[PDB]
Design an enzyme around this catalytic site. Structure first.
Site, PDB file in Angstrom:
ATOM      1  N   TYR A   1      -5.903  31.249  48.841  1.00  0.00           N
ATOM      2  CA  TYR A   1      -5.817  29.825  49.051  1.00  0.00           C
ATOM      3  C   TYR A   1      -4.245  29.356  49.482  1.00  0.00           C
ATOM      4  O   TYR A   1      -4.145  28.930  50.551  1.00  0.00           O
ATOM      5  CB  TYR A   1      -6.030  29.105  47.833  1.00  0.00           C
ATOM      6  CG  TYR A   1      -5.657  27.410  47.979  1.00  0.00           C
ATOM      7  CD1 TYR A   1      -6.245  26.763  48.660  1.00  0.00           C
ATOM      8  CD2 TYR A   1      -4.343  27.121  47.584  1.00  0.00           C
ATOM      9  CE1 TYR A   1      -6.006  25.404  48.959  1.00  0.00           C
ATOM     10  CE2 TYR A   1      -3.838  25.625  47.705  1.00  0.00           C
ATOM     11  CZ  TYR A   1      -4.940  24.892  48.336  1.00  0.00           C
ATOM     12  OH  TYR A   1      -4.279  23.648  48.643  1.00  0.00           O
TER      13      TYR A   1
ATOM     14  N   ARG B   1       5.294  23.127  39.752  1.00  0.00           N
ATOM     15  CA  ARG B   1       6.020  22.080  39.464  1.00  0.00           C
ATOM     16  C   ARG B   1       5.048  20.580  39.345  1.00  0.00           C
ATOM     17  O   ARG B   1       5.527  19.985  38.375  1.00  0.00           O
ATOM     18  CB  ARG B   1       7.265  22.010  40.329  1.00  0.00           C
ATOM     19  CG  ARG B   1       8.134  20.610  39.832  1.00  0.00           C
ATOM     20  CD  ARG B   1       7.901  19.284  40.583  1.00  0.00           C
ATOM     21  NE  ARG B   1       7.711  19.516  42.137  1.00  0.00           N
ATOM     22  CZ  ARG B   1       8.787  19.744  42.569  1.00  0.00           C
ATOM     23  NH1 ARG B   1      10.157  19.717  42.327  1.00  0.00           N
ATOM     24  NH2 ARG B   1       8.647  19.808  44.167  1.00  0.00           N
TER      25      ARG B   1
ATOM     26  N   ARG C   1      -6.410  16.553  40.918  1.00  0.00           N
ATOM     27  CA  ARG C   1      -6.657  17.809  41.677  1.00  0.00           C
ATOM     28  C   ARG C   1      -6.109  18.938  40.630  1.00  0.00           C
ATOM     29  O   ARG C   1      -5.410  18.846  39.763  1.00  0.00           O
ATOM     30  CB  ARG C   1      -5.307  17.863  42.773  1.00  0.00           C
ATOM     31  CG  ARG C   1      -5.835  16.831  43.884  1.00  0.00           C
ATOM     32  CD  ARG C   1      -4.390  16.682  44.879  1.00  0.00           C
ATOM     33  NE  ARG C   1      -3.126  16.254  44.362  1.00  0.00           N
ATOM     34  CZ  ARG C   1      -2.818  14.807  44.011  1.00  0.00           C
ATOM     35  NH1 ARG C   1      -3.696  13.882  44.363  1.00  0.00           N
ATOM     36  NH2 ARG C   1      -1.742  14.532  43.659  1.00  0.00           N
TER      37      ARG C   1
ATOM     38  N   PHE D   1      17.568  27.189  58.430  1.00  0.00           N
ATOM     39  CA  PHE D   1      16.178  26.723  58.269  1.00  0.00           C
ATOM     40  C   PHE D   1      15.269  27.433  57.217  1.00  0.00           C
ATOM     41  O   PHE D   1      14.799  26.625  56.344  1.00  0.00           O
ATOM     42  CB  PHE D   1      15.550  26.707  59.586  1.00  0.00           C
ATOM     43  CG  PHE D   1      14.165  26.261  59.747  1.00  0.00           C
ATOM     44  CD1 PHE D   1      13.683  25.099  59.547  1.00  0.00           C
ATOM     45  CD2 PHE D   1      13.044  27.137  60.097  1.00  0.00           C
ATOM     46  CE1 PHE D   1      12.379  24.533  59.616  1.00  0.00           C
ATOM     47  CE2 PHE D   1      11.762  26.909  60.009  1.00  0.00           C
ATOM     48  CZ  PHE D   1      11.445  25.421  60.067  1.00  0.00           C
TER      49      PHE D   1
HETATM   50  C1  LIG Z   1       6.798  28.268  54.898  1.00  0.00           C
HETATM   51  O1  LIG Z   1       7.478  27.086  54.984  1.00  0.00           O
HETATM   52  C2  LIG Z   1       8.773  27.255  55.660  1.00  0.00           C
HETATM   53  C3  LIG Z   1       9.347  28.502  56.305  1.00  0.00           C
HETATM   54  C4  LIG Z   1      10.645  28.376  56.641  1.00  0.00           C
HETATM   55  C5  LIG Z   1      11.081  26.998  56.704  1.00  0.00           C
HETATM   56  C6  LIG Z   1      10.681  26.024  56.186  1.00  0.00           C
HETATM   57  C7  LIG Z   1       9.438  25.942  55.566  1.00  0.00           C
HETATM   58  C8  LIG Z   1       8.675  24.790  55.301  1.00  0.00           C
HETATM   59  O2  LIG Z   1       9.671  23.659  54.656  1.00  0.00           O
HETATM   60  C9  LIG Z   1      10.074  23.678  53.604  1.00  0.00           C
HETATM   61  C10 LIG Z   1      11.023  22.292  53.754  1.00  0.00           C
HETATM   62  C11 LIG Z   1      10.396  21.082  54.474  1.00  0.00           C
HETATM   63  N1  LIG Z   1       8.902  20.725  53.606  1.00  0.00           N
HETATM   64  C12 LIG Z   1       8.836  19.468  53.274  1.00  0.00           C
HETATM   65  O3  LIG Z   1       7.728  18.729  53.367  1.00  0.00           O
HETATM   66  N2  LIG Z   1       9.803  18.585  52.207  1.00  0.00           N
HETATM   67  C13 LIG Z   1       9.398  17.287  52.208  1.00  0.00           C
HETATM   68  C14 LIG Z   1      11.016  16.716  52.136  1.00  0.00           C
HETATM   69  C15 LIG Z   1      11.942  17.403  51.390  1.00  0.00           C
HETATM   70  C16 LIG Z   1      13.686  16.833  51.486  1.00  0.00           C
HETATM   71  C17 LIG Z   1      13.476  15.322  50.961  1.00  0.00           C
HETATM   72  O4  LIG Z   1      12.742  14.713  50.125  1.00  0.00           O
HETATM   73  O5  LIG Z   1      14.687  14.898  51.679  1.00  0.00           O
HETATM   74  C18 LIG Z   1      11.958  18.808  51.513  1.00  0.00           C
HETATM   75  C19 LIG Z   1      10.552  19.481  51.369  1.00  0.00           C
HETATM   76  C20 LIG Z   1       7.812  21.476  54.139  1.00  0.00           C
HETATM   77  C21 LIG Z   1       7.111  22.040  53.474  1.00  0.00           C
HETATM   78  O6  LIG Z   1       7.223  22.222  52.040  1.00  0.00           O
HETATM   79  N3  LIG Z   1       6.350  23.453  54.077  1.00  0.00           N
HETATM   80  C22 LIG Z   1       5.918  24.552  53.001  1.00  0.00           C
HETATM   81  C23 LIG Z   1       4.613  24.489  52.605  1.00  0.00           C
HETATM   82  C24 LIG Z   1       3.575  24.929  53.833  1.00  0.00           C
HETATM   83  C25 LIG Z   1       4.549  25.597  51.437  1.00  0.00           C
HETATM   84  C26 LIG Z   1       4.179  23.022  52.088  1.00  0.00           C
HETATM   85  C27 LIG Z   1       6.612  23.420  55.265  1.00  0.00           C
HETATM   86  C28 LIG Z   1       5.496  22.930  56.109  1.00  0.00           C
HETATM   87  C29 LIG Z   1       5.688  22.778  57.610  1.00  0.00           C
HETATM   88  C30 LIG Z   1       6.725  23.651  58.165  1.00  0.00           C
HETATM   89 CL1  LIG Z   1       6.816  23.676  59.839  1.00  0.00          CL
HETATM   90  C31 LIG Z   1       7.725  24.295  57.319  1.00  0.00           C
HETATM   91  C32 LIG Z   1       7.489  24.504  55.852  1.00  0.00           C
END
Ligand SMILES: COc1ccccc1[C@H]1OCCCN(C(=O)N2CCC(CC(=O)O)CC2)CC(=O)N(CC(C)(C)C)c2ccc(Cl)cc21
Length: 335
Positions: free
Chosen positions: A136, A183, A193, A253
């Site tokens: 998943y 978390r 969920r 990043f």
């Molecule tokens: C595999 O993930 C990688 C790998 C390398 C780099 C970055 C990521 C990842 O980004 C983590 C930080 C941003 N994330 C986020 O939505 N926020 C929301 C606002 C928050 C800050 C705030 O509130 O001010 C930070 C966290 C997106 C995210 O969590 N993912 C990870 C997975 C897919 C597990 C959900 C994500 C999704 C798409 C991309 Cl292109 C990257 C990613």
């Protein structure tokens, strides 16, 4: 900047908030390619997440999403989710997708195809085994790490190994995803969920919702500690992954989310509050982590400090305690 690309950046700021600036700092062609991939994944996620969309409708949407990227007029108007704008104005995002170099388009489209297939497979089912949890997570997060890795190599800012080593890239995604799932126990519960794997929780209680009841708090914390121990297994790969990055903007990043997850796991370890509310990193804590996470020695230092913290907090009778100690020792003796 075209007006459609400006709208894309506005959506990125709306969706990724304080993290938008980190994406906006990526060098060269990586910037737009990541921004678009981010928005496209946000649209895919919003379809996946939306419980108002029937399974009959959702399966085709997920399967065919990769195709929509190529369909100038495709949009979706009936999402009741928070980021519905990226679906209602998908034509703006897909136009900018189709403006990317083809080497980035093809990465994004392949990933969307594979992720959609896997998301559709889990519509009916809850995660049972730890192996199913990793499957998943691969579909919703590991493939994101893999796609990003491929943009970095295809842009030539990073060595081809970064894009080819799918396991290390997958681990980058799994680390974040498992941390988030761990978390967000309670808010997920309240949203109806269940993501905690049934094979782990069923060893403690009869139903996953039982961890919210006061009488089961000890059992809940043991399961928490066990799942946290699971997530820590990805850290050697995360270190390996980060150690290979030669471009500063890519490093930052990739590194910033990983150290935030480290600090999150440490806040959640042996923490009853997970079961009563949303445990979060203090803003000032988060900012310093973001500013500090810019080279390997610093990121390793941060990992080691938080792991040492967990280590000294491990309860002797915790059922996972020796597994927790062992993975922490492995991490500590690598770099
Ligand atoms: C595999 O993930 C990688 C790998 C390398 C780099 C970055 C990521 C990842 O980004 C983590 C930080 C941003 N994330 C986020 O939505 N926020 C929301 C606002 C928050 C800050 C705030 O509130 O001010 C930070 C966290 C997106 C995210 O969590 N993912 C990870 C997975 C897919 C597990 C959900 C994500 C999704 C798409 C991309 Cl292109 C990257 C990613």
């Amino acid at each position: 900047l075209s007006s459609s690309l400006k709208t894309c950046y506005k959506y990125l700021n709306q969706t990724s908030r304080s993290f938008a600036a980190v994406i906006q700092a990526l060098d060269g062609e990586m910037r737009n390619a990541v921004c678009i991939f981010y928005l496209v994944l946000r649209a895919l996620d919003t379809l996946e997440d939306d419980m108002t969309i029937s399974v009959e409708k959702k399966v085709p949407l997920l399967h065919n999403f990769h195709s929509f990227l190529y369909q100038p007029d495709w949009r979706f108007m009936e999402s009741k989710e928070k980021d519905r704008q990226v679906l209602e104005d998908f034509p703006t995002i897909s136009l900018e997708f189709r403006n990317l170099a083809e080497k980035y388009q093809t990465v994004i489209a392949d990933i969307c195809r594979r992720m959609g297939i896997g998301m559709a497979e889990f519509l009916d089912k809850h995660v049972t085994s730890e192996q199913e949890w990793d499957k998943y997570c691969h579909y919703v997060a590991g493939l994101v790490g893999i796609g990003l890795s491929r943009l970095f190599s295809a842009s030539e800012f990073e060595d081809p190994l970064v894009g080819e080593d799918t396991e290390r890239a997958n681990s980058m995604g799994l680390f974040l995803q498992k941390t988030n799932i761990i978390r967000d126990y309670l808010e997920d519960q309240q949203g109806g969920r269940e993501f905690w794997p049934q094979e782990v929780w069923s060893r403690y209680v009869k139903k996953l919702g039982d961890f919210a009841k006061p009488e089961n708090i000890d059992l809940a914390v043991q399961c928490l500690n066990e799942l946290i121990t699971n997530a820590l297994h990805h850290i050697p790969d995360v270190i390996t992954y980060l150690s290979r990055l030669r471009n500063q903007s890519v490093f930052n990043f990739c590194a910033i989310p990983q150290v935030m997850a480290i600090a999150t796991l440490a806040a959640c370890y042996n923490n009853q509050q997970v079961f009563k509310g949303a445990v979060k990193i203090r803003k000032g804590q988060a900012v310093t982590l973001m500013m500090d996470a810019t080279n390997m020695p610093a990121v390793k230092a941060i990992i080691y400090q938080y792991m040492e913290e967990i280590y000294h907090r491990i309860p002797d009778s915790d059922p996972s305690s020796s597994k927790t100690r062992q993975i922490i020792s492995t991490i500590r003796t690598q770099n």
